[PDB]
Amino acid sequence: EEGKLVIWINGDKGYNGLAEVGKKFEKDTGIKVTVEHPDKLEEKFPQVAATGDGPDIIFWAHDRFGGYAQSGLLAEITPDKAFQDKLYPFTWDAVRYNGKLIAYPIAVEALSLIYNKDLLPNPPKTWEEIPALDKELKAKGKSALMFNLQEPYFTWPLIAADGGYAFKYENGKYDIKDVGVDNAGAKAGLTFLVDLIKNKHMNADTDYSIAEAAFNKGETAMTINGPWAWSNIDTSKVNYGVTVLPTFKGQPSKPFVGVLSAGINAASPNKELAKEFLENYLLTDEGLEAVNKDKPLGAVALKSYEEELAKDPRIAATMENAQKGEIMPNIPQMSAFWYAVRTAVINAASGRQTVDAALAAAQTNAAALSHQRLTSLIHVLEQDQQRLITAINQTHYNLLNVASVVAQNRRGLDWLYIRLGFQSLCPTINEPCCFLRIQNDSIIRLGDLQPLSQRVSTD
Amino acid sequence: EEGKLVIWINGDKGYNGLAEVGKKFEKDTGIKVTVEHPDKLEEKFPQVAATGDGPDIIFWAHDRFGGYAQSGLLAEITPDKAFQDKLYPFTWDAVRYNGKLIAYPIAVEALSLIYNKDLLPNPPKTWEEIPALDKELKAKGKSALMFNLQEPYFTWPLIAADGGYAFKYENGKYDIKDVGVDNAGAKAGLTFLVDLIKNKHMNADTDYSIAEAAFNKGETAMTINGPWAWSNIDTSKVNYGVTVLPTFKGQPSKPFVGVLSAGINAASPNKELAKEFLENYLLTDEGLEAVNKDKPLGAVALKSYEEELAKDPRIAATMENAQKGEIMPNIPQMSAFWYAVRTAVINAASGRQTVDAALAAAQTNAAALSHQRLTSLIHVLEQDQQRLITAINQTHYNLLNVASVVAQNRRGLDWLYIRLGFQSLCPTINEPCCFLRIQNDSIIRLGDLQPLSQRVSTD
Amino acid sequence: EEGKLVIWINGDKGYNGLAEVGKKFEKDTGIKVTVEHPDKLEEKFPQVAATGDGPDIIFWAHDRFGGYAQSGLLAEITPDKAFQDKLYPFTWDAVRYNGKLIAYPIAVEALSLIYNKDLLPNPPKTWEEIPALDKELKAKGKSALMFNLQEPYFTWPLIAADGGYAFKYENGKYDIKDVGVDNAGAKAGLTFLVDLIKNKHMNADTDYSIAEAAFNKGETAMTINGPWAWSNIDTSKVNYGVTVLPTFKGQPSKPFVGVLSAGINAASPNKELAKEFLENYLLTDEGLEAVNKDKPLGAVALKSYEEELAKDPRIAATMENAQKGEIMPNIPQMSAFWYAVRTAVINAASGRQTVDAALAAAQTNAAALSHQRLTSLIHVLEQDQQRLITAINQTHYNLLNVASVVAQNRRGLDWLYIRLGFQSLCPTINEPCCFLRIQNDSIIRLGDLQPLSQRVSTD
Ligand SMILES: OC[C@H]1O[C@H](O[C@H]2[C@H](O)[C@@H](O)[C@@H](O)O[C@@H]2CO)[C@H](O)[C@@H](O)[C@@H]1O
Ligand SMILES: OC[C@H]1O[C@H](O[C@H]2[C@H](O)[C@@H](O)[C@@H](O)O[C@@H]2CO)[C@H](O)[C@@H](O)[C@@H]1O
Ligand SMILES: OC[C@H]1O[C@H](O[C@H]2[C@H](O)[C@@H](O)[C@@H](O)O[C@@H]2CO)[C@H](O)[C@@H](O)[C@@H]1O
Ligand SMILES: [Cl-]
């Protein structure tokens, strides 16, 4: 592991293009670079890193990096002044935590409205016109809009539009106790979304893959997604545009803006190699181009290459949406916020909770990293109890099966004894009879249990 | 469910009288009203309401409504100025939360001392005289005092008398971090109560039903209860009075005063029908009278009807005790407070904990809604582990039973083989013998486990 | 239990000498005194005391007593002015909590460097010289240093040296939210220690017993321990000295100073007997001498006897280290702090976590008594799940064993039926055949579960 590099990046990004940068590094230096894209990497990273494992370099939007740093998992990076000047200062702000740089910023990501120019020459300026737009499109076997409803990143622009917010920003400092997921703006936003589902303009089950396939197959007029998605739309040959997100109550949708960033694992014995790879290889016009040609990065942090990329109307639209949204905080509590909003949106979308109760609970859960932890614990314990009860049940049925064969064996022993002219088995061998007797009251008592979450609230 | 009303109210209130109001509503409008009184309604409500179920209207004392509102579960009510003027302003204060009305107030409830005039013509002015009073009554086969020891509502007046308090009220705002369940006043109060149990003037097991039956049967000279209880005493024909609660250390007992209130479920598609039922039907002299004749409501919020009720010496006594106690907060943390005091009082009463350790723990638990949650979780997990271990144990014994029949079957197979002049089973069929071999070290290791609560504290 | 005394004291202290004081008490008064030294007494005490059990008198360093008092478990002690003057005021400060005395102080304990004068005539002034010292000692079949790595008390002096601290002390008041276990000083301290283990100058598994035996057997040049340990070194006949702890980065090591103290259980019906035992018997030159001759107490609180003890160069060294360290807080949060640092040090020492991730987690856990509680809960639940799964697994294998005998019984039934000229069992008795059929998918699904802690973090 010393003398080589392992890099993790998300499965929706240009990892094959990044591997080409790794191949050039290897060509020039002899150093092997391996790029992986595990699932749930943003959750896997802190677990493996804490034990001194995990990759040398970790790529994610900047919002998770404050927590990683607070947890002891990141090396402070040491770019000199000349390198720092190569990148936009606002990108350096995104990766600064308690005064220290904790990652290299790569690219600015914001969500936009992506629309099919052949189905919809002139896309809606407002969210409110969508149901009527969907009505007409449905008559022709299409739909107006499909996007990932399973990740709150995609719904947040709408929730934020009328006033919803994560943590209040005042005096240059986020207040972790002031959360705006349950104010009037947020409620209106999510109610409008759940209204779309109620009136069957969207489906609660739609996830990344489903929306992408529908848009890329010409089935839906619009989707909501980031620069990474453009590559596959090009391949699909759909005639698409990338524009400003619809307004809600006359207010701009407010995407949470992410800076794709690369951190160095505090436990890496390859911190200098990682620095040189990121600074001398990836963060160059040629390194970034290789990644971008694979899956587009968005508006890159590197001024020299961004000056070219900026002339792309897709990148102009990206930055227009960015300017309307807000840069994500990188505070450790961002993971509690996302977990809470994720739970709210899914619960509300699927009709398992009301909008207002979903959001009230999110408000509580976002307002403490320990709050979600308790929520997560009870959720996981509830699952474990069901797995335990299931195993206990199956063993019971297994035992009943075995008993059935034992009973047949006993009947066969008796029949034969009698047929050969003895008494039945037990008086013949002169033993008190052993009878099958199975108690099941315990098993029945387990099958009665309401789920753990309910029983904890009802105590 | 649209076009009809479902109402929940507690099993100790006039629900048959409320159903008569529902019947009149149905007569005038065609709208069916169904009144239910499930057990634990105050705990069932928030669970079903959060999923968009539960009743249209929920009745409880006002203290729980802040939490329900904070959780997204209540509609703001919209009574006009003319209706608002019909009710006392202090009752409207009880149902106001973060500036909004969240329920209709119905009636003011306070606990009083109810005494048997034939056993006790002149009831005690002080708690301290009770043991000597009980001494003499016991000589004649009676007791001085019996009341519900399972619900802290009933013991709180005593605990509060010498200085105990829930949340500190200053600057018109409750301090959730300043809790007075473990100060000197509170300790003295609960010690005096546990002293009554120690010296056998009361029993820790006495609950609502036991006290009510004893008083109503003429077995005990005194009880502590609310206006709802009077109805059944009338039926019993006991000659009773309703008076000021005894003093403790020369201080008035301080009942936590409740306003029976009716909220509208945020998820009800019948919010206007509910408004009209509460405003045009229940909150009238005739609506309230129908409920009151069933079980007395106390001092009603409706000025017109209260002006009659006030002439009742029982209602005068009720309000004298109310004025000496304090209006309950309606803050979300009230449920943590009640849970904590409930646990303390029962633990101390039953001698499972010392007064001082019981109250110290209550202090901690009341000082955070998340604190009780952890306490409740561990309590529930401890129960679940025991249920799991019990099932695991019974399956083990089931398996031993099955094995016993299998062993007898094997002995019978061998005997017969030999009797028919073969060798035993296994050399005859030419197989290595399979032997019953049951491992039980796991089962024994489970039977060794101290309860979860102890093991978590001892980690 | 009324009319006798039960005393708990730790197994490393002079409990046989304390029992001699108990015997003198019994001789003079008739009152039986029983001294016990259960394991984990500091954790057992609060559990048994809360139920009104446990000893009359509890001995521990003063740091745990604030929590015991806050939990309702200690009697305020009532020494008069004349008795108070017998002991140093700073010892009385150690046992004062929210303005009240909650224990009798006995003796001041600080860790020192204990060295073998024959292996090491001139012990190191610095931690940094130890690896080179160990290098040379190892060549002669010895080692430089061995001390208990399982209890953070012993490692803290080093962690504190360069700036690590527990709770920030300002304005005479500890800030429970300002914890210094994860600052630069603390990280450097623990990194140096783990570096010693990496480079094999110490072993992560070394505990109290192992270090004591190695030093007392002449195998290692140095150990770190308190006055109690001297007694067994005397017995060993090793030629030892007791000196100032090594410096780290030119800074003194900073032992957390403990005052061995004796509290009276709030639930004791023997509070006056306990007072008289502690004041009239133990806290005398003769009482303390009896304990000290068993295992040395350190610098005693009793001025009269300390004036003699102070002339001991071992006691001078003890107090030099004390003055360089700091008196422990007695705040309730000390137990969360010790639990957190214990976990960090072991995790880092054993290489299960990195120094930086270990300490970051400790920082979080020390910063709330409820934080550790959640950590402890998940740790205990993880263990319980494994015990449950193990039992579920063994029952499965038990059932497979039983099934194997049942299958052999069936084969023997068939063979015999056929041999006696019938058909096989089932067509002969004219029954559909029952077959053994065991489902195991549940069991396999349980064997797949990652540990609970990981799954809760990954939710
Ligand atoms: O859905 C919550 C999720 O949102 C963001 O993740 C984005 C990411 O920033 C983009 O690069 C892209 O991969 O889509 C992701 C959503 O699936 C946050 O960065 C992440 O922390 C958060 O969990
Ligand atoms: O015991 C705690 C309990 O007290 C109060 O409940 C009262 C209620 O207000 C009365 O209407 C009557 O029904 O007796 C109840 C006690 O059993 C609080 O209102 C309730 O929130 C709390 O849990
Ligand atoms: O290791 C943490 C532990 O440290 C202290 O315990 C000391 C004790 O003070 C000494 O008398 C001696 O017995 O060694 C102990 C360490 O094993 C704290 O007093 C204790 O609260 C803490 O858990
Ligand atoms: Cl069998």
Author numbering:
A (entry chain A), B (entry chain A), C (entry chain A): 29 to 487
Provide text from the study.
Bovine Leukemia Virus (BLV) and Human T-Cell Leukemia Virus Type-1 (HTLV-1) are related deltaretroviruses that cause aggressive lymphoproliferative disorders in a small percentage of infected hosts. The retroviral class I fusion protein consists of the transmembrane glycoprotein (TM) component of the envelope glycoprotein complex. Membrane fusion is achieved by re-folding of the TM from a native non-fusogenic structure through a rod-like pre-hairpin intermediate, in which the C- and N-terminal segments are embedded in the viral and target cell membranes respectively. The pre-hairpin intermediate then resolves to a trimer-of-hairpins structure, which pulls the membranes together and facilitates lipid mixing and membrane fusion.
Here we show the structure of the post-fusion conformation of the BLV TM ectodomain and demonstrate that coordinated ions and a network of hydrogen-bonded water molecules make critical contributions to the assembly and stability of the trimer-of-hairpins form of the BLV TM and are essential for TM-mediated fusion. As anticipated, the overall fold of the BLV TM ectodomain is that of a trimer-of-hairpins, with the N-terminal α-helices twisting around each other to produce the central triple-stranded coiled coil that is characteristic of class I fusion proteins. Buried leucine and isoleucine residues within the coiled coil predominantly mediate the interactions between monomers, but strikingly there are two polar layers within the coiled coil that establish interactions with ordered water molecules and a chloride ion respectively (see below). The predicted disulphide between Cys384 and Cys391 is reduced in the resolved structure but this does not appear to affect the overall protein fold. After Cys391, the LHR begins with an extended non-helical leash followed by an eight-residue α-helix. This helix is followed by a three-residue linker incorporating a single proline, allowing a sharp kink in the LHR prior to the start of a second α-helix that adopts an orientation almost 90° to the first helical segment of the LHR. In this position, Thr353 participates in a complex network of hydrogen bonding via several buried ordered water molecules. Based on the chemical environment, the shape of the density and B factor comparisons we have modeled this feature as a chloride ion. This chloride ion is situated towards the chain reversal end of the coiled coil between a group of three asparagines, one from each monomer of TM (Asn367). Intriguingly, Arg413 projects back along the axis of the coiled coil and binds between Leu407 and Leu410, where it forms hydrogen bonds with Gln343 from the same N-helix and Asp342 from an adjacent N-helix and also donates a hydrogen bond, through the ε-nitrogen, to the main chain carbonyl of Glu408 of the LHR. The most notable difference between the HTLV-1 and BLV TM structures is the resolution of a second helical motif within the LHR of the trimer-of-hairpins.
